[PDB]
Design a protein around this nucleic acid. Structure first.
Ligand SMILES: [Ca+2]
Ligand SMILES: [Ca+2]
Ligand SMILES: [Ca+2]
Ligand SMILES: [Ca+2]
Ligand SMILES: [Ca+2]
Ligand SMILES: [Ca+2]
Ligand SMILES: [Ca+2]
Ligand SMILES: [Ca+2]
Ligand SMILES: [Cl-]
Ligand SMILES: [K+]
Ligand SMILES: [K+]
Length: 54
DNA sequence: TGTCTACCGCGTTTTAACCGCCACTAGAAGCGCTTACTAGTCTCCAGGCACGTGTGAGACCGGCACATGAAAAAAAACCGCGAT
Protein backbone atom coordinates (compact mmCIF):
# COMPACT_ATOMS: atom_id res chain seq x y z
CA UNK A 1 0.00 0.00 0.00
CA UNK A 2 1.35 3.42 -1.11
CA UNK A 3 0.92 6.40 1.23
CA UNK A 4 -2.31 8.20 0.30
CA UNK A 5 -2.67 11.46 -1.71
CA UNK A 6 -5.96 13.45 -1.64
CA UNK A 7 -7.61 13.86 -5.04
CA UNK A 8 -7.52 17.58 -4.31
CA UNK A 9 -3.72 17.52 -4.05
CA UNK A 10 -3.35 15.76 -7.39
CA UNK A 11 -5.76 18.35 -8.90
CA UNK A 12 -3.86 21.27 -7.38
CA UNK A 13 -6.95 22.27 -5.37
CA UNK A 14 -7.92 23.55 -1.94
CA UNK A 15 -11.54 22.40 -2.38
CA UNK A 16 -12.40 18.78 -1.42
CA UNK A 17 -12.66 16.72 -4.59
CA UNK A 18 -13.59 13.58 -2.66
CA UNK A 19 -16.36 15.28 -0.67
CA UNK A 20 -17.73 16.81 -3.91
CA UNK A 21 -17.70 13.38 -5.59
CA UNK A 22 -19.60 12.00 -2.64
CA UNK A 23 -22.14 14.82 -2.71
CA UNK A 24 -22.75 14.19 -6.43
CA UNK A 25 -23.34 10.43 -5.93
CA UNK A 26 -25.66 10.97 -2.95
CA UNK A 27 -27.52 13.96 -4.38
CA UNK A 28 -29.66 12.06 -6.90
CA UNK A 29 -28.27 13.81 -9.97
CA UNK A 30 -27.43 10.85 -12.14
CA UNK A 31 -26.88 7.12 -11.88
CA UNK A 32 -23.08 7.46 -12.34
CA UNK A 33 -20.47 10.15 -11.88
CA UNK A 34 -17.24 10.33 -13.95
CA UNK A 35 -13.88 10.87 -12.24
CA UNK A 36 -13.36 14.32 -13.80
CA UNK A 37 -16.72 15.76 -12.73
CA UNK A 38 -15.99 16.44 -9.10
CA UNK A 39 -12.52 17.73 -9.99
CA UNK A 40 -13.97 20.27 -12.41
CA UNK A 41 -16.83 21.22 -10.02
CA UNK A 42 -14.52 21.57 -7.02
CA UNK A 43 -12.29 23.86 -9.07
CA UNK A 44 -15.23 26.04 -10.12
CA UNK A 45 -16.45 26.37 -6.56
CA UNK A 46 -12.84 27.40 -5.57
CA UNK A 47 -12.54 29.93 -8.35
CA UNK A 48 -15.88 31.60 -7.46
CA UNK A 49 -15.10 31.48 -3.76
CA UNK A 50 -11.71 33.10 -4.46
CA UNK A 51 -13.33 35.81 -6.58
CA UNK A 52 -15.91 36.84 -3.92
CA UNK A 53 -13.25 36.77 -1.15
CA UNK A 54 -10.89 38.90 -3.27
C1' DT B 1 -55.61 76.17 -19.06
C1' DG B 2 -53.02 76.96 -23.01
C1' DT B 3 -49.72 75.85 -26.66
C1' DC B 4 -47.45 72.99 -29.98
C1' DT B 5 -46.81 68.88 -32.69
C1' DA B 6 -46.43 64.11 -32.50
C1' DC B 7 -49.10 60.80 -33.54
C1' DC B 8 -53.33 58.51 -36.06
C1' DG B 9 -56.18 57.34 -40.12
C1' DC B 10 -56.36 56.85 -44.87
C1' DG B 11 -55.69 56.26 -49.91
C1' DT B 12 -52.09 55.13 -53.13
C1' DT B 13 -47.87 52.86 -54.79
C1' DT B 14 -44.50 49.52 -53.75
C1' DT B 15 -42.55 45.26 -51.82
C1' DA B 16 -41.73 40.78 -50.68
C1' DA B 17 -44.26 37.41 -47.88
C1' DC B 18 -46.57 33.34 -48.94
C1' DC B 19 -47.67 29.09 -51.18
C1' DG B 20 -46.91 24.97 -53.76
C1' DC B 21 -43.44 22.62 -56.04
C1' DC B 22 -39.21 20.23 -57.19
C1' DA B 23 -34.23 19.00 -56.66
C1' DC B 24 -30.30 17.98 -53.76
C1' DT B 25 -27.91 16.05 -49.72
C1' DA B 26 -26.24 17.35 -44.81
C1' DG B 27 -26.74 15.24 -40.97
C1' DA B 28 -30.12 13.25 -37.54
C1' DA B 29 -30.56 9.04 -35.79
C1' DG B 30 -30.69 3.73 -35.41
C1' DC B 31 -27.88 -0.51 -34.71
C1' DG B 32 -24.17 -3.96 -33.47
C1' DC B 33 -19.60 -4.49 -31.48
C1' DT B 34 -15.91 -3.72 -28.09
C1' DT B 35 -13.49 -1.77 -24.06
C1' DA B 36 -12.51 1.72 -20.97
C1' DC B 37 -14.32 3.33 -17.02
C1' DT B 38 -17.27 3.30 -13.03
C1' DA B 39 -19.55 0.87 -9.18
C1' DG B 40 -18.88 -1.94 -5.69
C1' DT B 41 -16.23 -4.12 -1.72
C1' DC B 42 -12.73 -4.48 1.64
C1' DT B 43 -9.14 -2.65 4.58
C1' DC B 44 -6.73 1.13 6.45
C1' DC B 45 -5.54 5.61 8.25
C1' DA B 46 -5.44 10.83 8.12
C1' DG B 47 -8.47 14.89 7.07
C1' DG B 48 -11.74 17.42 9.29
C1' DC B 49 -14.74 17.50 13.09
C1' DA B 50 -16.22 18.81 18.21
C1' DC B 51 -14.16 20.89 22.05
C1' DG B 52 -11.34 24.07 24.74
C1' DT B 53 -8.64 28.38 25.41
C1' DG B 54 -6.21 32.90 24.60
C1' DT B 55 -5.74 37.60 23.17
C1' DG B 56 -6.41 41.31 19.87
C1' DA B 57 -10.11 43.11 16.70
C1' DG B 58 -13.81 45.68 17.10
C1' DA B 59 -17.64 47.96 19.63
C1' DC B 60 -18.33 51.66 22.50
C1' DC B 61 -17.71 56.02 24.30
C1' DG B 62 -15.98 61.14 24.88
C1' DG B 63 -13.68 64.88 22.76
C1' DC B 64 -12.69 67.44 18.92
C1' DA B 65 -12.33 68.92 13.92
C1' DC B 66 -15.00 69.76 10.08
C1' DA B 67 -18.62 69.64 6.75
C1' DT B 68 -22.82 71.72 5.48
C1' DG B 69 -27.68 73.49 6.02
C1' DA B 70 -30.44 77.56 7.07
C1' DA B 71 -30.92 82.24 8.61
C1' DA B 72 -30.20 87.05 8.20
C1' DA B 73 -28.58 90.46 5.58
C1' DA B 74 -26.22 92.51 1.97
C1' DA B 75 -25.83 93.13 -3.05
C1' DA B 76 -27.75 92.33 -8.24
C1' DA B 77 -31.10 91.94 -11.19
C1' DC B 78 -35.39 91.69 -13.11
C1' DC B 79 -40.36 92.26 -13.82
C1' DG B 80 -43.24 95.00 -14.30
C1' DC B 81 -46.69 99.76 -13.46
C1' DG B 82 -47.72 103.54 -16.46
C1' DA B 83 -45.42 107.82 -18.07
C1' DT B 84 -43.85 111.33 -23.58
CA1 LIG C 1 -8.48 28.54 -8.46
CA1 LIG D 1 -8.34 35.72 -8.14
CA1 LIG E 1 -23.45 12.02 -38.14
CA1 LIG F 1 -4.81 16.34 12.07
CA1 LIG G 1 -12.97 24.96 15.19
CA1 LIG H 1 0.13 39.09 24.93
CA1 LIG I 1 -6.04 36.38 17.48
CA1 LIG J 1 -1.07 43.86 20.19
CL1 LIG K 1 -15.49 12.72 -16.10
K1 LIG L 1 -32.62 15.39 -8.79
K1 LIG M 1 -15.39 3.27 -24.64
Amino acid sequence: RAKAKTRSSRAGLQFPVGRVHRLLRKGNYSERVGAGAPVYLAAVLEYLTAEILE
